[PDB]
């Protein structure tokens, strides 16, 4: 049964259609594939990663595959319905200031990241785009196709998967290995972008994002990140003085600014972990994170 078209995408098409199994309207995602190519991989590789990871993780802050149908050539995926994407709401001029709602979004993201990190899954790309908010207002990561698992035995690692607008310096420097800290850097960019309501760092690719990262935080010292010069892809930019976090984004939370600085630290080990962020004073503060019941809802 098809009730409505939730969104149009080349990779896959989203439909606001009630499930045949359940009368209540549910989010349905249908993969789009072409048999025209002489050589084909069958199910899309990104789609294959997204379906297995979604089945593996069951969490309030992680979207889950309730049911899926492979009997048809097309694959239909059943997910909890989400009222609107987070990115459109953020880019829209806020009617009021919602700092506790911003705190709630970050807390949900950290709890969801902690659950996948505990399962050992790594999310390669985190951004306001490809993020969905339900009527409940719980934050869920819509796409796990970007996410790639990492293992102790050496294996091929995807690079430049993270968005050009929000990319870790090590990924820009083409570091062979990736870490949980890279996800924290992406969360720090999202938190800074959330306060601004516009992307914190513009990325045009070709190391343009790396130049912007150097301009905002100053040039990283050799002590700040070990063997940065040793890495095969290394570029030296002009020695910018840097902008204090409370000048780029006017915000200077007593604990929020410290958390933002830890997320923006160049070294992954120095960068604050998701578990430390859960225990961070800013989250445990007199302002209370929104449960999502009072979260603003369009129409």
């Amino acid at each position: 049964e098809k009730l409505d078209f939730l969104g149009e995408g080349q990779f896959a098409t989203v439909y606001k259609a009630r499930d045949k199994n359940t009368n209540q309207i549910v989010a349905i995602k249908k993969i789009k594939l072409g048999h025209r190519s002489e050589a084909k991989d069958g199910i899309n590789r990104t789609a294959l990663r997204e379906i297995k990871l979604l089945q593996e993780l069951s969490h309030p802050n992680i979207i889950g595959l309730l049911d899926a149908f492979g009997h048809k050539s097309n694959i239909s995926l059943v997910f909890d319905f989400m009222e609107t994407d987070l990115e459109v709401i953020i880019k829209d001029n806020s009617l009021v200031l919602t700092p506790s709602h911003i705190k709630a979004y970050m807390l949900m993201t950290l709890q969801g990241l902690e659950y996948l990190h505990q399962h050992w899954i790594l999310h390669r790309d985190l951004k306001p785009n490809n993020l969905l908010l339900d009527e409940n207002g719980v934050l869920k990561l819509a796409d796990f196709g970007l996410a790639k698992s990492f293992g102790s035995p050496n294996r091929a690692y995807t690079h430049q998967v993270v968005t050009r607008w929000y990319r870790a310096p090590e990924l820009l420097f083409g570091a062979r290995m990736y870490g949980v800290g890279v996800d924290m850097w992406a969360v720090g960019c999202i938190l800074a972008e959330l306060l601004l309501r516009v992307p914190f760092l513009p990325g045009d690719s070709d190391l343009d994002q790396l130049t912007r990262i150097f301009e905002t935080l100053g040039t990283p010292t050799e002590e700040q990140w070990p063997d940065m010069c040793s890495l095969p892809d290394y570029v030296t930019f002009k020695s910018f003085p840097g902008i204090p976090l409370h000048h780029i984004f006017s915000a200077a939370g007593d604990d929020l600014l410290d958390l933002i600085q830890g997320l923006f630290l160049f070294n992954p080990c120095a960068r604050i972990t998701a578990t430390q962020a859960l225990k961070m004073k800013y989250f445990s503060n007199r302002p209370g994170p929104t449960p999502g019941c009072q979260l603003p809802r369009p129409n």
Binding site: V96, H101, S250, A251, P296
Partner: peptide, 24 residues
Amino acid sequence: DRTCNNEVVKMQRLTLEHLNQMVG
């Protein structure tokens, strides 16, 4: 204060009612 809501009005542009619907 560099915290609270008054810092985020410096970030916002041509806001006309930020104190009401949600607060601080």
